[PDB]
Symmetry: C3
Subunit: 274 residues, 3 copies
């Protein structure tokens, strides 16, 4: 699976040399195998692409005088920023992620675990939000690591009944969840991958919320457990957004219609009854 950095280095390296700003790691070396690289000393964006290893390597770079001429993504990137935004679609462990969407390591691990089908565009997920699935709940044991003691036949028995379990432990026998576009998810939020298949477009998940069921489009959910406090817009307004899908507009189209995006009232007058 290509990392975020590999996907960008593909796009933008264009025959340049990779300049590693920071102490390299094993994961970074494996990612830099197809490319030629050296430690960063003097760097010129015309000959070098700067890879900061950690986020603290990046702010050291950005506080250096040579960062003056480097553009984000085009000329530099952070390796330890797998959830960082990009202005184009990318793949996070083969999970599609739309433009201008970012998240933290709890969501990265969820993509790796297969819990996520897709993440949409213009979606903002706090770095401490978490997504996990339930263990089996209708067996004599609740442990998962006990399966490290199962031989092949016991494991087979065990896997057979996990797949028939209608509560979807470890997200078995359910569709991976789709996180919509223009979604907001707050700090320390939790989403149960065993019971959630959908976070609708425009949904807001407040800080500390424990999400155990699907979140309808443009609903605001808070609490432990999370419940709908309100919707961002009227039911007539939501139907309109889901039809227009401004999050699919081009960059040109976004700027030319910024008004309708800044003013929900004007959006409704223009696109409601067309």
């Amino acid at each position: 699976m290509k990392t975020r950095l590999e996907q960008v280095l593909e796009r933008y390296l264009n025959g340049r040399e990779v300049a590693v700003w920071g102490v390299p790691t094993r994961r970074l070396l494996r990612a830099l195998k197809p490319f030629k690289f050296h430690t960063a000393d003097r760097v010129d964006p015309q000959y070098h692409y700067v890879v900061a290893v950690t986020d603290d390597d990046l702010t050291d770079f950005l506080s250096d005088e040579q960062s003056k001429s480097f553009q984000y993504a085009n000329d530099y990137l952070t390796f330890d920023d797998e959830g960082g935004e990009l202005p184009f679609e990318r793949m996070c462990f083969n999970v599609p992620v739309g433009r201008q969407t970012y998240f933290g390591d709890g969501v990265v691990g969820a993509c790796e675990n297969g819990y996520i089908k897709s993440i949409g565009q213009f979606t903002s997920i706090n770095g401490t939000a978490e997504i996990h699935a339930n263990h089996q709940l209708n067996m004599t044991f609740v442990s998962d690591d006990i399966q490290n003691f199962f031989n092949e036949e016991s494991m087979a028995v065990f896997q057979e009944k996990l797949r028939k379990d209608p509560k979807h432990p470890y997200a078995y026998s359910k569709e991976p969840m789709t996180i919509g576009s223009d979604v907001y998810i707050g700090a320390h939020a939790f989403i149960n991958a065993s019971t959630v298949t959908s976070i609708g477009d425009g949904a807001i998940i407040g800080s500390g919320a424990v999400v155990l069921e699907n979140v309808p489009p443009f609903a605001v959910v808070v609490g432990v457990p999370a419940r709908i406090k309100r919707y961002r817009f009227s039911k007539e307004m939501i139907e309109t957004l889901l039809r227009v899908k401004w999050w699919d507009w081009s960059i040109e189209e976004i700027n030319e219609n910024v008004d309708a995006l800044i003013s929900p009232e004007l959006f409704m007058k223009k696109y409601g009854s067309l």
Copy 2:
């Protein structure tokens, strides 16, 4: 006291070389001095025991075609994983921990602070769960780091009132808490070491739960603060489980009883 890695190496190294997968740190080099170690390049389990420094290094190692012949614990381990599961009973800062039981740094720190008496077998604690004790609440101040300014005279009367406080600030004057076997603790959960002395066997603690009270065996508790939602099993089943104690079974009898472990109804017909 001995770190998790040292207990594993003493048991499984078997005269091999330690092959370090990742950038070695000061703490790792100190723990590796009694042994022979080198940076990992080409490794074979007949001659090398692979130690991944960070969990980032481990996933890179498991991505290497060389890792296929390496079995967990017996042939490789992560150093930045003091709470990671082991197939044998271990110690975590003088705290007994059962087989196939894992937890995060929040719980490792709790063992180091003396908050935990023991942790059972086959217990699953999410990495973000926290265990902490309360600051003092019967004083003019709640700060703890103000004591960095206390001389020994002030330190003495401060320590004095703490240990008499019936609300057990910093878990003073109370027994450390036992965490049972087959326990599940969810993400961002919190357990108050001032007020909790037992998490019973089989208890489930939900994500985001704030646990201020002992949790009975096989109770499911959720919420802020945590309340008992339901129990996993009937009363008679719970008694049977507390008598049978399948979590003390050997590896073979766990496999022999996989049908009873999978189906609670078959468990009762057999053992009830």
Copy 3:
């Protein structure tokens, strides 16, 4: 803006060589350029100031025999610790922070973002507490990173509506929040920078609490969202504390009056 380390070295280094304990990073090498430094081998507090890079490095250092003659802050410090306590008033991204006050990376970021005006003395903030502001809620979109696509003119009208917004998205058009002295903030707590301007002196914010409005002095708030459960003291006691301000006492005054700090009744009798 000076890092925490820079502020400590300026105050305590006193012509000694900086001895680096751990793998040095790019950020650290830059911070150490105005000073003479080398990798730590053998160290003597008479001639060396030890800088541990990570908290892991510091654990190794304090377990080494060479450390037992070293005093915290005066002779050693961790570089990976901008939220760590200091015995003197410091700045964190030009936010004033009182003595013996500590917090985690979530609060360091809030200082960097401009969400915090000041943090008082002897205040204890758990490492998993978080402080953030709201996105705009009066527009068709909630995203913030859409503005990366806004051309020059679209950016202008976007920022103009942000500034006139009474719910203060991104903490616009509001005062940064003041966190008081003798404050306690628990694990996984959250404070909303868009609606909160004051955490009063002596306030207690429980574990898991979601704080959406101002916390009065010496109030105890818990829950999701946080609600006032009780106050630490009587109203007249609270007014006396806010007038006396023991948290600004000198070190000598704290030790001389330790019995009043340990006994609330003695405090009220002496200062009420």
